[PDB]
């Protein structure tokens, strides 16, 4: 009935391009100790640390599978990928073998539905982009931003008005929708916008209403030019508050951004949340890697 935000760090390999430009790793990663060392003497610990050799299935098992279980119990869940552009958020979240979190979680969801034969289940999905505090519905997109509203009901549940929700019965249908949403996003950068893929599960007793939501979010790139003036800083403020024993029982400032408002019922409290902080090990990215390590640390 209450749980901390779980923070996972994912370190990707140094990329060919980075190697060819003369860069080398500035991170020593110790997965079994749950920790990393930046440069010579900057040490950071996280709930889960995944090294460059951790494959997609390993990330999914470490970070996401336990959310999937709470989702079917009727808890809300979110997994978000955070980090600078180029760090591996999209690769990790898998919405665009090498398949990422979304296809694996959806594959498992439909198997669970098949297994729970005493429940009658309905699943629908929405797929939204947030850019400069305006929504675009990627499954419609003929939808004016002004016609999508984010509200909250009396029981604290987030209510979307004007967003397309599509019933799905299998992974094939989910993959098809993701392909079209991703096509629709282009015909403004993907690294300056957030995307939110929301899966809603409605379960009723007898013969395959408890309602839960699982959000999969691929956040805007965290890089900075160098107080709360950005959606990433609003999200960081919220997760900081939740992780702070003095602040966590006080008023959590969800209202500051659309991203924190849409996740309000699915971020800490009674919901289960995992942040996957993605980092480049490249020495060329030292400063942004430090920024992400520090941001992720504030959530613990
Ligand atoms: N864990 C990983 N293993 C191998 N390649 C990766 C990994 N993470 C990211 N990459 C690659 O690094 C590049 C940037 O990844 P991407 O997912 O686009 O990052 P972001 O979404 O954070 O900008 C892509 O070419 C991607 O294939
Ligand atoms: Mg990306």
Residue numbers in the entry: 9 to 104, 112 to 202, 209 to 229, 240 to 257, 271 to 344
Quote the original article.
Kif7, a member of the kinesin 4 superfamily, is implicated in a variety of diseases including Joubert, hydrolethalus and acrocallosal syndromes. Members of the kinesin superfamily of motor proteins (Kifs) move unidirectionally along microtubules (MTs) in an ATP-dependent manner. Kif7, a critical regulator of mammalian Hh signalling, acts as both a positive and negative regulator in the Hh signalling pathway but performs this role differently from Cos2 in that it does not interact with Smo or Fu.
Kif7 contains an eight-stranded β-sheet core with three major solvent-exposed α-helices on each side, displaying the characteristic arrowhead-like structure typical of all members of the kinesin superfamily solved to date. In summary, the structure of human Kif7 resembles that of human conventional kinesin.
